[PDB]
Design an enzyme around this catalytic site. Structure first.
Site, PDB file in Angstrom:
ATOM      1  N   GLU B   3       2.656   3.976  -4.172  1.00 50.04           N
ATOM      2  CA  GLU B   3       2.600   2.527  -4.346  1.00 50.04           C
ATOM      3  C   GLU B   3       3.096   1.799  -3.095  1.00 50.04           C
ATOM      4  O   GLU B   3       4.072   1.049  -3.119  1.00 50.04           O
ATOM      5  CB  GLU B   3       3.388   2.094  -5.586  1.00 50.04           C
ATOM      6  N   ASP B   4       2.384   2.034  -1.993  1.00 48.93           N
ATOM      7  CA  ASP B   4       2.609   1.329  -0.731  1.00 48.93           C
ATOM      8  C   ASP B   4       4.050   1.462  -0.247  1.00 48.93           C
ATOM      9  O   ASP B   4       4.672   0.494   0.190  1.00 48.93           O
ATOM     10  CB  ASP B   4       2.213  -0.143  -0.845  1.00 48.93           C
ATOM     11  N   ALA B   5       4.587   2.673  -0.322  1.00 48.94           N
ATOM     12  CA  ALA B   5       5.868   3.001   0.281  1.00 48.94           C
ATOM     13  C   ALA B   5       5.648   4.038   1.373  1.00 48.94           C
ATOM     14  O   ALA B   5       4.659   4.773   1.358  1.00 48.94           O
ATOM     15  CB  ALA B   5       6.859   3.528  -0.758  1.00 48.94           C
ATOM     16  N   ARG B 176      -8.332  -0.989  -0.318  1.00 47.74           N
ATOM     17  CA  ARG B 176      -7.883  -1.897   0.724  1.00 47.74           C
ATOM     18  C   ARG B 176      -8.888  -2.020   1.852  1.00 47.74           C
ATOM     19  O   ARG B 176      -8.967  -3.076   2.479  1.00 47.74           O
ATOM     20  CB  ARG B 176      -6.538  -1.439   1.296  1.00 47.74           C
TER      21      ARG B 176
ATOM     22  N   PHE C   7       5.965  -1.413  -4.441  1.00 55.36           N
ATOM     23  CA  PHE C   7       7.064  -1.247  -3.492  1.00 55.36           C
ATOM     24  C   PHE C   7       6.640  -1.694  -2.092  1.00 55.36           C
ATOM     25  O   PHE C   7       6.674  -0.940  -1.124  1.00 55.36           O
ATOM     26  CB  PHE C   7       7.540   0.198  -3.499  1.00 55.36           C
TER      27      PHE C   7
END
Ligand SMILES: [Mg+2]
Ligand SMILES: [Zn+2]
Ligand SMILES: [Zn+2]
Lengths: 76, 280, 152, 258, 48, 56, 94, 65
Positions: B3-5, B176, C7
């Protein structure tokens, strides 16, 4: 008249909602090693936020030890 | 890194990667009230009302100004100043560091303001090593916070001896739709191997096919993928992995400036509810 | 998915109840595991996302096989309190045991569970039709036949 | 059985082949070299004057990054508890110019900067810089400043290039251009993957059926390079001795249970 | 309280009181801005 | 009882925890170091409950 | 290095190993797996941050040997192999 | 501000090689051959020398005492 009405007026935003004590806010980072019903809390927040506990027979020892720890060691 | 970490190497951070510094300037003025009663810079004696703890004024010189290159840690007085009791006493009106901040005093400036009174400006610098929660972003819109810091020996390494500086999640690429990031990843390693920078202009830049052919000519796969070995187990992963060089920027939304806690605190006047803002 | 959070710089608030009744209400009414089923449509909300689904596919895909060390390490990492490995499924070259992903996954399931359905990966309806005929003929077909007519 | 053959030995690097051990042992050796082998490094700096354009916390980091030579005979670098011996580095600079690592003065002749041409800071006219740095033994796992170099390995593999391919001559020419050993045989050309060998786009079609790669079991190609703190052979021997010491300590603690 | 204050422009060693001084200026270049120089005490900073 | 809804169980546990904190004795032996609330949950799970609920 | 026995019973032993990480844990586990009498053995790091230096092991045997004897055999084998590799390296490098 | 002492990724000391590389590439030599001659082989090291910008010289003018 304007004091009562409005988003920042008395009726709403002042009794409906208000600033609260015993709260914290910070960013969130992932952690899959904890259970789904747990949250990782920074040790710094734990030192500040507190939970009042009444001293009873079955927790006198732990509370006594944590009082002995003082306000600078973590379990205090 | 879900999750976009992102996952960042620890040894690279310890060698000076994305290390930054933060400045903030505090300001105090010796106001000249009407009637001749004026403020003054001094060490506040315990007599004055509002006199905080003795430890707070611990590194001020006798003129009432802090010593440069001294260590402050929060609620420490930077400029000692006492105001007239007019709303036989002296109100304490010192200027102190913000309650949640920390750093080292960098410079102290003494000036004469426009009205003829005194004006003092102090700047405190703070070192900010990357940590969990710090926000990073690329030029192609990918944003994220550091999810975990990994020791170097636990990081995978390619068969040619390259250890990644940062690991991103493959799920962030589709939905994206930022093929430009992959093209830049190819181009960065091509430029680094070839010793010359790569033109990436909007519509006249170097075409992708040329970059892939050049990468093929330098002994690497045209796809940009490489074979790596797992850090813990020590055996090579089943699939070959995509790796390159991408330009990343550290944003100023850093967790050291966003954390906030409140146990009891002060309250307002009219509503007597808790105040609003991290500073107070 | 419940908090609808990512996040990428999001911030969240934490509240600490102070009274015993408030603590009891928070513990009994608002525990996380009590809200797995959504009240909007009667289906699960707290489920796997992204890598969970993808890794599940990778683990239980056809042709996936795992060695002894991988099986033991992943079982210990998950936290399953196993004590003895099951019988090996296929023996590869050099006489090393191999375990299929389906066995490892089935070690995580309850003992009495029976369900069948069609997932999103279906592309050949004929195989699913044949499997459905086999299951519907008698509700407990022999496992070997089902393994013969297996299909992702 | 176990054997070691050395391919190439440069001044600050060595590339050898390790044969007869499991993957776990090779990974353990690599991680032990990366994280457990101790060296000397600056730990704290005591500034007296700093008028340079760089902050104290930047000059301190640059001083920490400098590699310092480490004696081998004086200390027992393979022990599980390290000495607290401290070596002081001093410096006094002034005037226009660049302050190099060679201007540091050491209390102990055995410990001093390896490379005397590393720039530390550019002093303008009138700016001064005086401090007293303190160096002590430390392990690479605690902080990267103590790392004694960089190590990686790879599988020892042979690539089979069948001669049925119409253009195997180009593949052989490419392999010889790269530098990998080439052993020609009937019906197949054998390439030893001393360094990675990625086949081009045109021959990518033949991968698997014609160009197939075999893995020689329990054989690895190690690459160890050092920044000058220790000789490479000392690094490898120290890592192996550390592994032996850890095994003995585990034996002792385990026996303590009975 | 006599103290040393470096000048902002010319960087000269100006020493003067501030509590009693009414007009603040550098006696060489006339600047109205001065610095407070760093003390001569040893500061210790971790090289982390 | 017949059946305890979520709200009734929460109310009973909260009331018992408050009573225990204010000084009421515990009718079940409990491990040392437990908070009053978790003592209330243990008491409820054991089945000894001294508080009844009134229904319309 | 410290050994903290989580639980010991029959032919099972579970313990923490304070002061260690993957470096020695993986080597010890892979050496243990070679023993024919060890039915199950593995290790894990419970949390990458909090338990970064506290790997947790599990050893299960078939009753022919006790687990603390299989661990001794594995450690002795590790020591012997390291010594042999050291001798070979010393001979080769000079 | 100034050239880093060690490569961020692998840690090879490259602090002393920047000025030589700049002079050689400015003289007219092929940058690839210059980088190969200096010993830098992995592209992680070459990136640090290639993309570095010297900013200590134009911030040295403003002094703070
Ligand atoms: Mg968001
Ligand atoms: Zn002047
Ligand atoms: Zn490098």
């Amino acid at each position: 008249a304007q004091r009562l009405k409005g988003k920042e007026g008395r009726f709403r935003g002042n009794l409906s909602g208000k600033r609260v004590n015993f709260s914290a806010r910070t960013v969130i980072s992932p952690d899959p090693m904890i259970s789904i019903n747990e949250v990782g809390v920074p040790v710094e927040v734990a030192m500040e936020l507190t939970v009042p506990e009444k001293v009873t027979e079955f927790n006198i020892e732990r509370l006594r030890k944590m009082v002995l720890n003082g306000p600078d060691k973590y379990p205090g | 890194n879900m999750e976009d970490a992102i996952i960042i190497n620890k040894a690279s951070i310890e060698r000076g990667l994305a290390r930054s510094t933060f400045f903030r300037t505090y300001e105090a003025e010796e106001k000249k009230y009407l009637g001749g009663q004026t403020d003054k810079f001094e060490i506040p004696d315990p007599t004055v009302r509002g006199y905080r703890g003795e430890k707070y004024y611990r590194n001020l010189d006798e003129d009432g100004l802090i010593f440069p290159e001294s260590k402050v840690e929060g609620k420490d007085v930077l400029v000692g100043r006492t105001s007239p009791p007019r709303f036989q006493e002296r109100r304490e009106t010192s200027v102190a560091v913000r309650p949640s901040e920390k750093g080292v005093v960098d410079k102290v400036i003494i000036t004469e303001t426009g009205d003829g009174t005194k004006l003092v400006k102090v700047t405190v610098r703070d070192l900010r090593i990357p940590e969990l929660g710090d926000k990073f972003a690329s030029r192609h819109g990918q944003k994220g916070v550091i999810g975990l810091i990994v020791p170097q020996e636990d990081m995978p390494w390619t068969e040619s001896g390259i250890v990644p500086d940062l690991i991103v999640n493959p799920h962030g690429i589709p939905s994206r739709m930022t093929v430009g990031q992959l093209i830049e990843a190819i181009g960065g390693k091509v430029a680094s191997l070839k010793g010359r920078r790569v033109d990436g202009t909007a519509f006249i830049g170097e075409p992708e096919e040329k970059l892939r052919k050049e990468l093929e000519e330098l002994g690497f796969k045209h796809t940009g993928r490489e074979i790596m070995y797992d850090g813990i187990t020590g055996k090579r992963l089943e699939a070959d992995i995509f790796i390159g060089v991408i330009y990343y920027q550290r944003l100023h939304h850093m967790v050291a400036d966003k954390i906030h806690a409140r146990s009891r605190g002060p309250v307002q006047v009219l509503t007597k509810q808790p105040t609003e803002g991290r500073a107070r | 998915p419940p908090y609808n959070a990512d996040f990428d710089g999001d911030e969240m608030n934490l509240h600490v109840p102070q009274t015993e009744e408030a603590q009891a209400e928070a513990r009994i009414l608002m525990e996380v595991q009590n809200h797995i089923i959504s009240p909007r449509y009667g289906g699960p909300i707290i489920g796997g996302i992204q890598d969970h689904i993808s890794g599940g596919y990778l683990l239980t895909r056809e042709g996936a096989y795992f060695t002894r060390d991988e099986v033991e390490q992943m079982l210990m990492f998950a936290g399953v309190d196993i004590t003895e490995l099951p019988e090996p499924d296929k023996y590869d070259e050099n006489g090393n045991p191999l375990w299929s992903g389906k066995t490892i996954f089935s070690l995580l399931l309850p003992e009495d569970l029976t369900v069948w359905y069609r997932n999103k990966l279906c592309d050949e309806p004929e195989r699913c039709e044949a499997l459905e005929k086999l299951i519907e003929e008698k509700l407990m077909p022999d496992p070997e036949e089902v393994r013969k007519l297996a299909y992702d | 059985g176990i054997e070691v053959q050395i391919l190439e030995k440069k001044e600050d690097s060595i590339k050898f082949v390790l044969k007869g051990v499991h993957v776990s042992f090779a990974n353990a050796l690599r991680r032990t070299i990366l994280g457990e082998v101790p060296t000397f490094a600056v730990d704290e700096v005591e500034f007296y004057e700093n008028d340079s354009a760089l902050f104290d916390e930047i000059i301190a980091h640059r001083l920490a990054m400098i590699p310092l030579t480490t004696p081998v005979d004086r200390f027992e670098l393979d022990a599980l508890e390290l000495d607290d011996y401290t070596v002081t580095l001093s410096l006094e600079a002034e005037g226009p110019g660049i302050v190099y690592s060679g201007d540091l003065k050491s209390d102990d002749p055995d410990v001093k900067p390896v490379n005397p041409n590393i720039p530390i800071v550019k002093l303008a006219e009138g700016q001064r810089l005086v401090f007293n740095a303190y160096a002590k033994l430390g392990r690479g796992k605690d902080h990267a400043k103590w790392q004694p170099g960089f190590v990686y390995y790879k599988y020892y593999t042979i690539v089979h290039i069948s001669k049925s391919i119409p253009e195997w001559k180009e593949l052989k020419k490419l392999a010889k251009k790269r530098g990998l050993p080439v052993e020609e045989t009937e019906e197949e050309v054998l390439v030893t993957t001393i360094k990675p060998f990625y086949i081009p786009k045109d021959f990518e079609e033949y991968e698997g059926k014609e160009i197939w790669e075999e893995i020689v079991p329990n054989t690895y190609i190690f690459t160890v390079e050092t920044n000058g703190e220790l000789p490479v052979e000392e690094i490898v021997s120290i890592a192996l001795k550390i592994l032996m010491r850890k095994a003995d300590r585990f034996i002792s603690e385990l026996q303590k249970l009975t | 309280v006599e103290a040393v204050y470096r000048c902002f422009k010319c960087g000269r060693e100006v020493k003067l009181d501030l509590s009693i001084t009414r007009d603040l200026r550098c006696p060489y270049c006339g600047s109205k801005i001065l610095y407070k120089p760093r003390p001569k005490v040893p500061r210790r900073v971790k090289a982390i | 009882m017949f059946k305890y809804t979520r709200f009734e169980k929460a109310r009973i546990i909260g009331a018992r925890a408050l009573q225990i904190s204010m000084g009421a004795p515990v009718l079940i032996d409990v491990p040392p170091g437990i908070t009053p609330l978790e003592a209330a949950i243990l008491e409820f799970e054991k089945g000894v409950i001294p508080i009844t609920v009134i229904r319309p | 290095m410290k050994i903290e026995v989580i639980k010991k019973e029959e032919n099972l032993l579970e313990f923490y190993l304070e002061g260690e990480d993957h470096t020695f844990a993986n080597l010890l586990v892979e050496t243990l797996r070679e023993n024919p009498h060890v039915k199950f053995t593995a290790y894990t790091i419970e949390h990458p941050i909090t338990m970064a230096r506290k790997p947790r092991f599990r050893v299960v045997t078939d009753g022919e040997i006790t687990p603390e004897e299989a661990l001794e055999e594995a450690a002795k084998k590790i020591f012997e192999r390291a010594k042999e590799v050291l001798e070979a390296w010393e001979k080769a490098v000079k | 501000m100034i050239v880093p002492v060690r490569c961020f990724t692998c840690g090879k000391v490259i602090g002393d090689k920047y000025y030589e590389f700049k002079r050689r590439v400015e003289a007219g030599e092929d940058p690839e051959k210059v980088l190969d001659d200096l010993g830098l082989e992995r592209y992680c090291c070459r990136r640090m020398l290639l993309s570095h910008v010297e900013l200590i010289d134009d911030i040295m003018h403003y002094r703070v005492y």
